[PDB]
Each structure stands twice: as C-alpha cells, then as structure tokens.
C-alpha cells in the first residue's frame, strides 16, 4: 500500500503533485485484476491540470509514500520489482503504446528486492528522460508486490500479485528526437496469468530465479536507479 507524492527533476522537488500532475487514485489500495482498465493508470485515470516540464537527459525521480510523506514508504513484506513505462499522452494509455524505460527486480549482490531498496531510498526512484519527440507524455511507475503472488487473482481474488500503479503527466520540452519512441505494449493486456513474474512464490523459490514480466527495457532508454536524490525533511 503506497502512492506517489510527487516528482523531482535533476534533484529539485517539483512540489506535491497529487491530483495536480499525478493522476492519483483516492487511496493506496492495490490493483490486482490484470484485465481491468485500472491497470493503465489506476482507478481514477483522468487528465489532471498540470504537466511537469523536463528535457531529454534530465533525471526524473518518483517519490512514493505510505500514509504520510517520507514515512515507511511501503510495508517491508511487499517484496517485488519496480518498472517505469512511457506512452504519448494522446493515447490516454490505450492501445499498444507503453514502452519500458526501467526494470529492477532482485539484486544478487546486495540480496535485495527493488522494493527493499525503495524503502532505503525514502521512496525515491528515477529514470533519465529519453531523446524522444517533444510533447506531452504519461510516465507509468509500477511496483509489483509479490507477497501473495503464489496465487492468481483470476482464480482466488483474495490473493494475487499486487500492482501499485501511478501515472505522471510529463512534458518533454527540449529533445532532439534522436531516439523516437518504438512500439509498446498495452495495459491492461501485457500481463496475463502465464506471464513470467506474475505468479511466483518468494518464500520457496530463490529470488535469483525470478524473472520480471516482459517487455524488456527499450534499448533507447537511458537507465535509472533506486536511490534517494533529495531530502524531503528539508522543506
Ligand atoms: O519459516 C520458514 C518458512 O517460510 C515459509 O514461508 C511463509 C512465510 O514464512 C510467511 O509467513 C508467508 O506469509 C505471508 C502471507 O502469504 C501474506 O498473505 C501476508 O500478507 C500480509 C502482508 O504481509 C502485510 O503487509 C499486509 O498488511 C496490509 C494490511 O492487510 C492492510 O491492508 C493495510 O491497509 C491499511 C493501509 O496500509 C493504510 O495506509 C490505511 O491507512 C489509512 C487509515 O485507515 C485512515 O483511512 C487514514 O485517515 O488514512 C490512512 C491513509 O493515509 O489503512 C489501511 C487499513 O487499515 O495495509 C497493510 C500493508 O501496508 O497484510 C497482508 C495480509 O492481509 O504476508 C505474509 C508474510 O509477511 O507465508 C509463507 C507460506 O506460509 C516457506 O513456505 C517455507 O519454505 C519456510 O520453511
Ligand atoms: O528541467 C527542464 C525544465 O526545467 C524547468 O524549470 C524548473 C526548474 O528547472 C526547477 O525545477 C523549478 O523548481 C521549482 C519548483 O517547481 C517549485 O517552484 C519549488 O517551490 O521551487 C523549485 C525551485 O527550487 O521548477 C521549474 C519548472 O516549474 C523549465 O521551466 C522548463 O522550461 C524546462 O523544460
Ligand atoms: C476484472 O476486470 C474485468 C474487466 O473490466 C471485469 O469484467 C471483471 O469482472 C473483473 N474481475 C473481478 C473479479 O472484478
Ligand atoms: Cl496486502
Ligand atoms: Cl476503495
Ligand atoms: Cl483489482
Ligand atoms: Cl502545466
Ligand atoms: Cl541520474
Ligand atoms: Cl510488513
Ligand atoms: Cl503496514
Ligand atoms: Cl500526445
Ligand atoms: Cl498530446
Ligand atoms: Cl533498468
Ligand atoms: Cl538511497
Ligand atoms: Cl517520439
Ligand atoms: Cl472464487
Ligand atoms: Cl487484458
Ligand atoms: Cl528480471
Ligand atoms: Cl528495444
Ligand atoms: Cl537515474
Ligand atoms: Cu499493501
């Protein structure tokens, strides 16, 4: 149970974005139904009044929280991967449009899940903005908590993988469009019951065996990290 508070750009806090530049749901409940329209941008997908300006090569940081800003972030039990996708805003997230910019699942060296590292990062994880066409975009950050993912929601609706999905309105201003955006995947649609990483038992299968759900990260993506960029408590 977690939500996005806002974003930072190049280490500068853009301010509370909830219902402003983040298409925020009313609470931190998970989405579990893989075939639901809620998989696109969570349960209250609508245009919100602002879009955060960035240029290609900037670092865009999403900041999550549980109940209040810079708290426990997400329950430790919720081990699982983190991804970020991008789609042009004209799609409203429909169709075959979401392109993966970032994936982190399990880190063998550190013996930590992406979620574990997100808590240590005070909720903060980043992507470098790609050299796509200037315009308006949706950035879809997705945490998959696997603590009940040994079951499928479609079979047992009280269990299943949990998706914590947040879409940010981002306007890319300066970019040379040297890596135009490729074909993407649909949400809902990309994840199905048979997709690797949707059903998995974190308690008996080694975490070194986990494979996150495709798609693979686009070759044009400029990477990203799970790491604190700014101190919220210094506001
Ligand atoms: O011994 C070795 C042995 O291991 C074997 O594996 C075992 C494991 O050992 C392990 O025990 C495991 O068990 C799993 C189990 O399968 C899962 O079901 C379980 O799931 C837990 C989860 O851990 C936990 O985090 C979760 O907590 C939820 C909670 O349910 C609520 O949903 C809660 O909701 C609150 C929100 O968080 C708040 O934000 C919100 O706050 C509101 C407030 O209410 C007001 O509205 C206020 O004004 O606003 C606020 C918002 O600002 O309030 C709501 C409701 O109060 O959220 C938390 C999460 O944050 O609960 C679930 C269950 O419900 O996890 C455990 C593990 O932890 O099982 C295996 C198998 O037995 C292994 O098999 C063997 O090989 C080995 O030898
Ligand atoms: O990075 C590309 C984008 O930059 C825009 O300018 C930013 C500044 O770079 C900086 O982030 C600034 O941050 C503000 C914040 O929005 C808020 O006011 C807070 O109270 O204070 C900080 C400063 O500490 O915000 C602007 C954008 O709103 C620039 O406007 C765009 O043209 C560029 O594409
Ligand atoms: C899953 O979402 C689909 C798509 O809207 C809906 O028809 C279906 O009833 C949902 N399943 C549950 C258990 O609500
Ligand atoms: Cl839960
Ligand atoms: Cl609800
Ligand atoms: Cl659901
Ligand atoms: Cl705006
Ligand atoms: Cl960076
Ligand atoms: Cl916990
Ligand atoms: Cl909790
Ligand atoms: Cl558009
Ligand atoms: Cl547009
Ligand atoms: Cl990555
Ligand atoms: Cl950190
Ligand atoms: Cl493009
Ligand atoms: Cl049932
Ligand atoms: Cl579907
Ligand atoms: Cl993986
Ligand atoms: Cl690719
Ligand atoms: Cl980064
Ligand atoms: Cu939860």
PDB file of N, CA and C in Angstrom, residues 116-172:
ATOM      1  N   UNK A 116      12.689  -3.341  -1.423  1.00  0.00           N
ATOM      2  CA  UNK A 116      13.504  -3.200  -0.238  1.00  0.00           C
ATOM      3  C   UNK A 116      14.396  -1.922  -0.389  1.00  0.00           C
ATOM      4  N   UNK A 117      15.018  -1.787  -1.579  1.00  0.00           N
ATOM      5  CA  UNK A 117      15.840  -0.618  -1.900  1.00  0.00           C
ATOM      6  C   UNK A 117      15.079   0.678  -2.026  1.00  0.00           C
ATOM      7  N   UNK A 118      13.810   0.595  -2.378  1.00  0.00           N
ATOM      8  CA  UNK A 118      12.988   1.773  -2.438  1.00  0.00           C
ATOM      9  C   UNK A 118      12.709   2.316  -1.056  1.00  0.00           C
ATOM     10  N   UNK A 119      12.413   1.445  -0.106  1.00  0.00           N
ATOM     11  CA  UNK A 119      12.293   1.909   1.287  1.00  0.00           C
ATOM     12  C   UNK A 119      13.564   2.628   1.826  1.00  0.00           C
ATOM     13  N   UNK A 120      14.728   2.072   1.510  1.00  0.00           N
ATOM     14  CA  UNK A 120      16.021   2.601   1.981  1.00  0.00           C
ATOM     15  C   UNK A 120      16.212   3.965   1.297  1.00  0.00           C
ATOM     16  N   UNK A 121      15.722   4.084   0.036  1.00  0.00           N
ATOM     17  CA  UNK A 121      15.748   5.350  -0.717  1.00  0.00           C
ATOM     18  C   UNK A 121      14.672   6.370  -0.373  1.00  0.00           C
ATOM     19  N   UNK A 122      13.963   6.212   0.748  1.00  0.00           N
ATOM     20  CA  UNK A 122      12.915   7.179   1.149  1.00  0.00           C
ATOM     21  C   UNK A 122      11.906   7.347   0.034  1.00  0.00           C
ATOM     22  N   UNK A 123      11.633   6.241  -0.665  1.00  0.00           N
ATOM     23  CA  UNK A 123      10.586   6.249  -1.673  1.00  0.00           C
ATOM     24  C   UNK A 123      10.964   6.684  -3.068  1.00  0.00           C
ATOM     25  N   UNK A 124      12.254   6.969  -3.275  1.00  0.00           N
ATOM     26  CA  UNK A 124      12.646   7.619  -4.479  1.00  0.00           C
ATOM     27  C   UNK A 124      13.368   6.710  -5.501  1.00  0.00           C
ATOM     28  N   UNK A 125      12.869   6.750  -6.738  1.00  0.00           N
ATOM     29  CA  UNK A 125      13.485   6.034  -7.825  1.00  0.00           C
ATOM     30  C   UNK A 125      13.333   6.916  -9.085  1.00  0.00           C
ATOM     31  N   UNK A 126      14.354   6.753  -9.970  1.00  0.00           N
ATOM     32  CA  UNK A 126      14.498   7.695 -11.092  1.00  0.00           C
ATOM     33  C   UNK A 126      14.669   7.014 -12.442  1.00  0.00           C
ATOM     34  N   UNK A 127      14.354   7.789 -13.489  1.00  0.00           N
ATOM     35  CA  UNK A 127      14.708   7.460 -14.849  1.00  0.00           C
ATOM     36  C   UNK A 127      15.326   8.705 -15.465  1.00  0.00           C
ATOM     37  N   UNK A 128      16.189   8.493 -16.454  1.00  0.00           N
ATOM     38  CA  UNK A 128      16.761   9.546 -17.238  1.00  0.00           C
ATOM     39  C   UNK A 128      15.818   9.717 -18.451  1.00  0.00           C
ATOM     40  N   UNK A 129      15.400  10.958 -18.746  1.00  0.00           N
ATOM     41  CA  UNK A 129      14.369  11.191 -19.769  1.00  0.00           C
ATOM     42  C   UNK A 129      15.006  10.908 -21.119  1.00  0.00           C
ATOM     43  N   UNK A 130      14.351  10.119 -21.961  1.00  0.00           N
ATOM     44  CA  UNK A 130      14.926   9.705 -23.233  1.00  0.00           C
ATOM     45  C   UNK A 130      14.807  10.810 -24.322  1.00  0.00           C
ATOM     46  N   UNK A 131      15.539  10.662 -25.422  1.00  0.00           N
ATOM     47  CA  UNK A 131      15.553  11.595 -26.572  1.00  0.00           C
ATOM     48  C   UNK A 131      14.396  11.331 -27.546  1.00  0.00           C
ATOM     49  N   UNK A 132      13.200  11.328 -26.994  1.00  0.00           N
ATOM     50  CA  UNK A 132      12.006  11.165 -27.760  1.00  0.00           C
ATOM     51  C   UNK A 132      11.458  12.517 -28.292  1.00  0.00           C
ATOM     52  N   UNK A 133      10.336  12.467 -29.082  1.00  0.00           N
ATOM     53  CA  UNK A 133       9.755  13.682 -29.747  1.00  0.00           C
ATOM     54  C   UNK A 133       9.348  14.568 -28.530  1.00  0.00           C
ATOM     55  N   UNK A 134       9.617  15.866 -28.638  1.00  0.00           N
ATOM     56  CA  UNK A 134       8.984  16.754 -27.663  1.00  0.00           C
ATOM     57  C   UNK A 134       7.528  16.598 -27.757  1.00  0.00           C
ATOM     58  N   UNK A 135       6.918  16.754 -26.615  1.00  0.00           N
ATOM     59  CA  UNK A 135       5.445  16.675 -26.448  1.00  0.00           C
ATOM     60  C   UNK A 135       5.028  16.264 -25.026  1.00  0.00           C
ATOM     61  N   UNK A 136       3.757  15.873 -24.923  1.00  0.00           N
ATOM     62  CA  UNK A 136       3.188  15.501 -23.645  1.00  0.00           C
ATOM     63  C   UNK A 136       3.160  13.987 -23.536  1.00  0.00           C
ATOM     64  N   UNK A 137       3.572  13.493 -22.360  1.00  0.00           N
ATOM     65  CA  UNK A 137       3.706  12.070 -22.070  1.00  0.00           C
ATOM     66  C   UNK A 137       3.116  11.681 -20.741  1.00  0.00           C
ATOM     67  N   UNK A 138       2.828  10.392 -20.626  1.00  0.00           N
ATOM     68  CA  UNK A 138       2.498   9.792 -19.349  1.00  0.00           C
ATOM     69  C   UNK A 138       3.658   8.898 -18.958  1.00  0.00           C
ATOM     70  N   UNK A 139       4.156   9.051 -17.720  1.00  0.00           N
ATOM     71  CA  UNK A 139       5.126   8.126 -17.177  1.00  0.00           C
ATOM     72  C   UNK A 139       4.458   7.242 -16.097  1.00  0.00           C
ATOM     73  N   UNK A 140       4.451   5.953 -16.331  1.00  0.00           N
ATOM     74  CA  UNK A 140       3.690   4.983 -15.512  1.00  0.00           C
ATOM     75  C   UNK A 140       4.708   4.227 -14.677  1.00  0.00           C
ATOM     76  N   UNK A 141       4.775   4.534 -13.377  1.00  0.00           N
ATOM     77  CA  UNK A 141       5.582   3.814 -12.423  1.00  0.00           C
ATOM     78  C   UNK A 141       4.773   2.706 -11.792  1.00  0.00           C
ATOM     79  N   UNK A 142       5.375   1.524 -11.720  1.00  0.00           N
ATOM     80  CA  UNK A 142       4.678   0.325 -11.284  1.00  0.00           C
ATOM     81  C   UNK A 142       5.525  -0.499 -10.354  1.00  0.00           C
ATOM     82  N   UNK A 143       5.017  -0.705  -9.163  1.00  0.00           N
ATOM     83  CA  UNK A 143       5.557  -1.588  -8.151  1.00  0.00           C
ATOM     84  C   UNK A 143       4.699  -2.838  -8.144  1.00  0.00           C
ATOM     85  N   UNK A 144       5.299  -4.021  -8.239  1.00  0.00           N
ATOM     86  CA  UNK A 144       4.568  -5.275  -8.084  1.00  0.00           C
ATOM     87  C   UNK A 144       4.947  -5.901  -6.761  1.00  0.00           C
ATOM     88  N   UNK A 145       4.026  -5.995  -5.814  1.00  0.00           N
ATOM     89  CA  UNK A 145       4.287  -6.662  -4.556  1.00  0.00           C
ATOM     90  C   UNK A 145       3.849  -8.133  -4.695  1.00  0.00           C
ATOM     91  N   UNK A 146       4.779  -9.014  -4.291  1.00  0.00           N
ATOM     92  CA  UNK A 146       4.649 -10.450  -4.569  1.00  0.00           C
ATOM     93  C   UNK A 146       4.304 -11.308  -3.340  1.00  0.00           C
ATOM     94  N   UNK A 147       4.004 -10.667  -2.212  1.00  0.00           N
ATOM     95  CA  UNK A 147       3.791 -11.420  -1.005  1.00  0.00           C
ATOM     96  C   UNK A 147       2.594 -12.425  -1.048  1.00  0.00           C
ATOM     97  N   UNK A 148       1.627 -12.205  -1.942  1.00  0.00           N
ATOM     98  CA  UNK A 148       0.544 -13.145  -2.158  1.00  0.00           C
ATOM     99  C   UNK A 148       0.479 -13.642  -3.607  1.00  0.00           C
ATOM    100  N   UNK A 149       1.626 -13.552  -4.306  1.00  0.00           N
ATOM    101  CA  UNK A 149       1.648 -13.882  -5.734  1.00  0.00           C
ATOM    102  C   UNK A 149       1.830 -15.393  -6.036  1.00  0.00           C
ATOM    103  N   UNK A 150       1.849 -16.217  -5.007  1.00  0.00           N
ATOM    104  CA  UNK A 150       1.782 -17.625  -5.235  1.00  0.00           C
ATOM    105  C   UNK A 150       0.444 -18.057  -5.807  1.00  0.00           C
ATOM    106  N   UNK A 151      -0.567 -17.264  -5.587  1.00  0.00           N
ATOM    107  CA  UNK A 151      -1.884 -17.456  -6.181  1.00  0.00           C
ATOM    108  C   UNK A 151      -2.127 -16.476  -7.284  1.00  0.00           C
ATOM    109  N   UNK A 152      -3.059 -16.839  -8.176  1.00  0.00           N
ATOM    110  CA  UNK A 152      -3.534 -15.931  -9.216  1.00  0.00           C
ATOM    111  C   UNK A 152      -4.816 -15.251  -8.829  1.00  0.00           C
ATOM    112  N   UNK A 153      -4.929 -13.945  -8.983  1.00  0.00           N
ATOM    113  CA  UNK A 153      -6.174 -13.242  -8.656  1.00  0.00           C
ATOM    114  C   UNK A 153      -7.371 -13.807  -9.406  1.00  0.00           C
ATOM    115  N   UNK A 154      -7.131 -14.155 -10.685  1.00  0.00           N
ATOM    116  CA  UNK A 154      -8.177 -14.675 -11.539  1.00  0.00           C
ATOM    117  C   UNK A 154      -8.806 -15.976 -11.006  1.00  0.00           C
ATOM    118  N   UNK A 155      -8.032 -16.703 -10.164  1.00  0.00           N
ATOM    119  CA  UNK A 155      -8.511 -17.916  -9.577  1.00  0.00           C
ATOM    120  C   UNK A 155      -8.974 -17.714  -8.135  1.00  0.00           C
ATOM    121  N   UNK A 156      -8.276 -16.837  -7.387  1.00  0.00           N
ATOM    122  CA  UNK A 156      -8.523 -16.615  -5.955  1.00  0.00           C
ATOM    123  C   UNK A 156      -8.428 -15.109  -5.748  1.00  0.00           C
ATOM    124  N   UNK A 157      -9.565 -14.437  -5.795  1.00  0.00           N
ATOM    125  CA  UNK A 157      -9.495 -12.968  -5.760  1.00  0.00           C
ATOM    126  C   UNK A 157      -9.045 -12.353  -4.406  1.00  0.00           C
ATOM    127  N   UNK A 158      -8.881 -13.179  -3.392  1.00  0.00           N
ATOM    128  CA  UNK A 158      -8.346 -12.637  -2.143  1.00  0.00           C
ATOM    129  C   UNK A 158      -6.812 -12.648  -2.103  1.00  0.00           C
ATOM    130  N   UNK A 159      -6.184 -13.246  -3.108  1.00  0.00           N
ATOM    131  CA  UNK A 159      -4.770 -13.244  -3.201  1.00  0.00           C
ATOM    132  C   UNK A 159      -4.327 -12.661  -4.567  1.00  0.00           C
ATOM    133  N   UNK A 160      -3.097 -12.911  -4.972  1.00  0.00           N
ATOM    134  CA  UNK A 160      -2.582 -12.455  -6.251  1.00  0.00           C
ATOM    135  C   UNK A 160      -1.486 -11.397  -6.106  1.00  0.00           C
ATOM    136  N   UNK A 161      -0.639 -11.317  -7.138  1.00  0.00           N
ATOM    137  CA  UNK A 161       0.221 -10.160  -7.272  1.00  0.00           C
ATOM    138  C   UNK A 161      -0.529  -8.830  -7.106  1.00  0.00           C
ATOM    139  N   UNK A 162       0.140  -7.842  -6.483  1.00  0.00           N
ATOM    140  CA  UNK A 162      -0.446  -6.541  -6.279  1.00  0.00           C
ATOM    141  C   UNK A 162       0.317  -5.501  -7.087  1.00  0.00           C
ATOM    142  N   UNK A 163      -0.426  -4.648  -7.757  1.00  0.00           N
ATOM    143  CA  UNK A 163       0.188  -3.575  -8.568  1.00  0.00           C
ATOM    144  C   UNK A 163      -0.151  -2.230  -7.949  1.00  0.00           C
ATOM    145  N   UNK A 164       0.918  -1.458  -7.705  1.00  0.00           N
ATOM    146  CA  UNK A 164       0.777  -0.131  -7.246  1.00  0.00           C
ATOM    147  C   UNK A 164       1.270   0.724  -8.441  1.00  0.00           C
ATOM    148  N   UNK A 165       0.321   1.408  -9.080  1.00  0.00           N
ATOM    149  CA  UNK A 165       0.493   1.997 -10.440  1.00  0.00           C
ATOM    150  C   UNK A 165       0.236   3.512 -10.289  1.00  0.00           C
ATOM    151  N   UNK A 166       1.193   4.330 -10.779  1.00  0.00           N
ATOM    152  CA  UNK A 166       0.983   5.745 -10.731  1.00  0.00           C
ATOM    153  C   UNK A 166       1.390   6.370 -12.046  1.00  0.00           C
ATOM    154  N   UNK A 167       0.556   7.203 -12.634  1.00  0.00           N
ATOM    155  CA  UNK A 167       0.891   7.889 -13.899  1.00  0.00           C
ATOM    156  C   UNK A 167       1.102   9.384 -13.637  1.00  0.00           C
ATOM    157  N   UNK A 168       2.263   9.869 -14.072  1.00  0.00           N
ATOM    158  CA  UNK A 168       2.668  11.280 -14.016  1.00  0.00           C
ATOM    159  C   UNK A 168       2.560  11.887 -15.400  1.00  0.00           C
ATOM    160  N   UNK A 169       1.990  13.087 -15.420  1.00  0.00           N
ATOM    161  CA  UNK A 169       1.988  13.907 -16.665  1.00  0.00           C
ATOM    162  C   UNK A 169       3.264  14.676 -16.773  1.00  0.00           C
ATOM    163  N   UNK A 170       4.013  14.386 -17.849  1.00  0.00           N
ATOM    164  CA  UNK A 170       5.337  14.993 -18.022  1.00  0.00           C
ATOM    165  C   UNK A 170       5.365  15.601 -19.421  1.00  0.00           C
ATOM    166  N   UNK A 171       5.842  16.858 -19.538  1.00  0.00           N
ATOM    167  CA  UNK A 171       6.026  17.431 -20.816  1.00  0.00           C
ATOM    168  C   UNK A 171       7.539  17.530 -21.141  1.00  0.00           C
ATOM    169  N   UNK A 172       7.918  16.904 -22.230  1.00  0.00           N
ATOM    170  CA  UNK A 172       9.274  16.967 -22.666  1.00  0.00           C
ATOM    171  C   UNK A 172       9.403  18.119 -23.687  1.00  0.00           C
TER     172      UNK A 172
END
